[PDB]
Amino acid sequence: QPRTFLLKYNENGTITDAVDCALDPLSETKCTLKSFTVEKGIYQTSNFRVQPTESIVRFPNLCPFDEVFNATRFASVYAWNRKRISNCVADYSVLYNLAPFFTFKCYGVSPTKLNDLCFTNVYADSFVIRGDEVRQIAPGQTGNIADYNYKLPDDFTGCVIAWNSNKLDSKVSGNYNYLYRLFRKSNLKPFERDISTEIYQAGNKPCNGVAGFNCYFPLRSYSFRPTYGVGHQPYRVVVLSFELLHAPATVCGPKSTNLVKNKCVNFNFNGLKGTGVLTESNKKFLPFQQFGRDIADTTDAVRDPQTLEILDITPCSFGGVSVITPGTNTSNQVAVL
Amino acid sequence: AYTNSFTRGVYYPDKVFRSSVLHSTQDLFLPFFSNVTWFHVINPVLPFNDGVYFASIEKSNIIRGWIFGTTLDSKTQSLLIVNNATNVVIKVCEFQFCNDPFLDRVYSSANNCTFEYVSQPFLKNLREFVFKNIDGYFKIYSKHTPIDLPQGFSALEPLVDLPIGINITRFQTLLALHRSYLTPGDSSSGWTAGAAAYYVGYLQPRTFLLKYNENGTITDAVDCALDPLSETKCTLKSFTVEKGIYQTSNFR
Amino acid sequence: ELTQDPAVSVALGQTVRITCQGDSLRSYYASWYQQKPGQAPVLVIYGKNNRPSGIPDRFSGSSSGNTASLTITGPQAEDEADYYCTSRDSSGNHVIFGGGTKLTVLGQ
Amino acid sequence: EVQLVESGGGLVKPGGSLRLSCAASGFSFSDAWMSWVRQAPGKGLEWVGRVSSEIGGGTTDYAAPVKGRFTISRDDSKNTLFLQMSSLKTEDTAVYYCTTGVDIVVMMYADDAFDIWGQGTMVTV
Ligand SMILES: *[C@@H]1O[C@H](CO)[C@@H](O)[C@H](O)[C@H]1NC(C)=O
Ligand SMILES: *[C@@H]1O[C@H](CO)[C@@H](O)[C@H](O)[C@H]1NC(C)=O
Ligand SMILES: *[C@@H]1O[C@H](CO)[C@@H](O)[C@H](O)[C@H]1NC(C)=O
Ligand SMILES: *[C@@H]1O[C@H](CO)[C@@H](O)[C@H](O)[C@H]1NC(C)=O
Ligand SMILES: *[C@@H]1O[C@H](CO)[C@@H](O)[C@H](O)[C@H]1NC(C)=O
Ligand SMILES: *[C@@H]1O[C@H](CO)[C@@H](O)[C@H](O)[C@H]1NC(C)=O
Structure with a gap:
């Protein structure tokens, strides 16, 4: 172990004894006096001080943000809406521990490190899709919806949230307001909406707007009912995206840890x-005063920025130690003051 | 038109609570028993220097706003205050102020902006204002007390600390009236408001001995450069001096 | 408030550059529209660097800080129209539009 | 798909009221973003206002020079747009175009792209 020793070199040049300063108060006294014998008396060997127990942090308050994750009626898959957020902290802790969230999958950012880095802009994409294509929403694969309604880029970043709507979208009569496209001439580029509902033209025939045979209407209707099982239920899916290194950072969440008293701890009250x-x-x-000073410029009090309470700060216990010994002549017992 | 200042114009310099201590503060203060120009409403542009102390003994709140900035009405950024019946608006938009800005709704035209702020309204009563700009901070200190300047001692509490870093060298006061033509280049026209008088004082770098009571409120002060007895008090760091001979400073 | 030159004089077969000056062009990338004389404006350049379907591969857009530029390669005689740049402001989120520019043909 | 038709407009004394009707069909009308643009004769395009969509909250915006004095609304049942004008001025003599913000674009921004336009109508005050 790394410690401090007092080695005794003889006339011959070879060490013949040693004392370990960390064993006993008597050994500490021997090291302090730099001798192997101590006479009767009281000696001041060192000074002690209680070590800190833990650390606390106190920072200001946050933003509220609820509306996008719980609305009345979400937009359709072919007409997804986007939201713009700026100059407000993004508290994702309330959503991470929320109960009815079923899906949390992403690649760009760590699932638990999303609040330790600061972004600039926040984009929220909201739509409703069937539970069968929840896996299909990931970038890279193609097919229905993923190529005809909503496509994601290969370098997409951000995490999406999906949850069930068993008791919020199911209707006994049947809901058909949610539409999707199965016929598109071209391929949708990433983050692109398609609102035109022109009838599909298949190679030939004069159905270029006549809406007759050999031509189908591309925007079909969903089938959304308590008689449906797992696989056809509507799932509300929200997509979050962001961009970096094009503007000063504006949106990111906050430490502001808990406050504890009556023990020596490390405190950070806004510095x-x-x-x-x-x-x-x-x-x-006074209302504008944050901290106080006693005589000789010593921090006597501080105001908690959270609850505005008045706290008195004093250093935790410290002081010197003294070892009472009757001398090595008689015995080796010691007392400590 | 000159009038004594007495012991008015002191404020809190550091926002730090202190109880029953004597603290020697070196900062930008108004000298005790200084001379301040006395104006009577019944408003020329003045230099700003290191700072300006503003006070009025006018009831009914005729005085409502002021102008600040360097090269006023030019391309350089400028600062403005208006006190409305509901809130105070502070505008930093480099507005092109007129020769006679406001004698009644807006005293300047709109322009590109960098900072805005709205807060609670500022306003036989005494109101005192101190304006400062150092290390990129614009601060205002204000106080109110029902009531020449009375001999009463009162410390001005800090009000706003604007992180803006604009440059200011000249200022002008704004007074309110009614039944006026809002002439940009003419003043004193139309109906005149109630009797109003305001004072202007210029701050200087001085050392003060501020006494804090048991509740953290400044109750007295000493201007170290006023007279030899004040030098003795500052050297002794006390408000009382016993009989004797004291070596205070040096002559050069 | 976007600023553009009044008119641009470029001969045939030469690269035509159309500029648009604005303070807030770092974000809210500008969109370019072409308005034929006595006709409704049409979309030519939008987004980052792409164009809507049906537009021939002759117009390309680029931005650098507070400057937006438009590039025309192989100009014909049917491109004589007005070009407008449209950006957005951070506070009001308005389209504000631009002052526009005039492009002509220096043919015989 | 797409056709936008403009109705209304003409000669009227200053201070009167006028309503402009724009009808669009072939694309879906509740879930898209519209906007209004004006253009003085011989001058550039000038913004008028926006109506947005009810899916996301009503945030109908207006241009600064004509803020408050113009009324905008959307009626998805009849697929018609009503634009009401009040307190007309001598500078209102221009042509008005109803423009669909997004038809086929990569947006990645606020929902405003001005893809497809209309023929426009003439109004004089
Ligand atoms: C060192 O060497 C000498 C010579 O052999 C010897 O006499 C002496 O005892 C040695 N030192 C010690 C401490 O024994
Ligand atoms: C911060 O929020 C807590 C939560 O209720 C509240 O008690 C406290 O007063 C707030 N502090 C400030 C400065 O808003
Ligand atoms: C040991 O020696 C010290 C040195 O003077 C002396 O004070 C002490 O009385 C001695 N103790 C005994 C038991 O002889
Ligand atoms: C800001 O306004 C001032 C005066 O109003 C003007 O001189 C300056 O050029 C303006 N700057 C910008 C970037 O608009
Ligand atoms: C403010 O501008 C004036 C000139 O109008 C200049 O003399 C002064 O030095 C400037 N302020 C500072 C802090 O430099
Ligand atoms: C200090 O404040 C307390 C309670 O507000 C009051 O009882 C006391 O008289 C005050 N003392 C002074 C010197 O103002």
Whole structure:
């Protein structure tokens, strides 16, 4: 182990004894006096101080943000809407632990590190799709909806949220307001909407708007009913995206840890880094005053930015130690003061 | 038109609570027993220097706003305050102010902007204002007390700290009236409001001995450069001096 | 407030550059529309660098900080029209449009 | 798919009221973003306002020079747009176009792209 020793070199040049300063108060006294014998008396060997127990942080408050993840009627898959968010903190902690969220899959960012980095802009994409194509929403694969309604780029970043709507979209009479396309001449580019509902033209025949035979209407209707089982239920899917390195950072979530008292801890009250014990005090600040000083410019009190409470700060216990020994002549017992 | 200032114009310099201590503060203060120009409404542009102390003894709130900036009405950014019946608006838009801005709704034209702020309204009563701009911070200190300047001592609490870093060298006051033509280049026209007088004082770098009571409120101060007794008090760091001979400073 | 030159004089077979100056062109990438004389405006250049379907591969757009540029390769005599740049402001989120520019043909 | 038709407009004394009707068909009308644009004769295009879609909240915006004095609305049942004008001025003599913001574009921005336009109508005050 790494410690401090006092080696005794003889006239011959070979060490013949040693003492370990970390064993006993007597050994500490021997090291302090740099000798192997101590006479009767009281000696001040060192000084002790209680170590800090933990750390706390106190920062200001946050944004509220609810509306996009719970609305009345979500937009269709072929007419998905987008939202713009700026100059407000993104508290994703409330959504990470929420109960009825079923799907959380992404690749660009870590599932738990999304709040440790700061972004610039936030884009929210909201639509409703059947539960069969939840796997299909990932970029890379093709087919229905993924190529005809909503396509994602290969370098897409961000995490999407999907949840069931068993008791919020099912109707006994039947709902058909949710539409999707199965016939498109070209391929949809990533992050592109298709709103035109022109009838499909198949090679030939004069159905170029006549809407007759050998031509089908591309926008078909969904089949959304309590008699349906797993696989046909409508799933609400929201897609979050962002861009970086094109503007100053504006949107990102907040530490603001819990407050503890009556023990020497490390505190950070909007700065003012230090270590000490926190106790309630009767001192009365002015509204604009944050912290107070005693004689000789010593931090006596501080105001918690969260609850505006008045806290008295004093250093935790410290002091010197003294070892009472009757001398190595008689015995080796010691007492500590 | 000159009038004594007495012990008015002191404010809180550091926003730090202190109880029953004597603290020597070196900052931008108004000298005690200084001379301040006295204006009577019944408004020329003045230099800003290191700072300006503004006070009025006018009831009914005729005085409502001011102008600040360097090269006023030019391309350089400028600062403006208006106190409405509901809120105070502080506008930083480099507005092109007129010769006689406001004698009644808007005293300047709109332009490109960089900072805006709206807060609670600022306003036989005394109102005192101190304007400063150092290390890129614009600060205003204000106080109110029902009531020449009374001898009463009162410390001005800080009000707003604007992180903006514009440059200011000249200012002008704004007064309110009624039944006026809003002439941009003419003043004193139309109906005149109630009797109003305001003062202008210029701050200087001074050392002060501020006494804090048991509740953290400044209750007295000493201007170290006013007279030899004040020098002795500052050197002793106390408000009382015993009989004797004291070596205070040096002559050069 | 976007700023554009009044008119551009480029001969046939030469690259034509159309500029649009604006303070907030770092974000909200500008969109270019072509308005024929006595006709409704049409979309030519939008998005990052692409164009709507049906537009011939002759117009390309690029941006650099607070400057937006339009490039024409192999100009014909039917391109004599007005070009407008449209951007967005951060606060009001308005399209504000632009002052436009005039492009002509220097043929015989 | 797509045809946009403009109705209304003409000669009217200043301070009167006029309503402009724009009808669109062939594309889906509740779930798309419209906008209004004007253009003075011999001048450039000028924005008028926006109506947006009810799927996401009504955030109908107006241009600064004509804020408050113009009324906009959307009626998805009859697929018609009504634009009401009040407190007309002498500078309102221009042509008005009803423009669909997005038909086929990569948006990645606010829902405003101005893909397809209309023929427009003439109004004089
Ligand atoms: C060192 O060497 C000498 C010579 O042999 C010897 O006498 C002496 O005892 C040695 N040192 C010790 C401490 O024994
Ligand atoms: C921060 O939010 C908490 C939560 O209720 C509240 O008690 C506290 O007063 C807030 N502080 C500020 C400065 O808004
Ligand atoms: C040991 O020696 C010290 C040195 O003076 C002396 O004070 C002490 O009385 C001695 N103790 C005994 C038991 O002889
Ligand atoms: C801002 O306004 C000032 C005066 O109004 C003007 O001189 C300056 O050129 C403007 N700057 C910009 C970027 O618009
Ligand atoms: C503000 O501008 C004036 C000139 O109008 C200049 O003399 C002064 O130095 C400027 N302020 C600072 C802090 O440089
Ligand atoms: C300080 O405040 C307390 C409670 O507000 C009051 O009882 C006391 O008289 C005050 N003391 C002084 C010197 O103002």
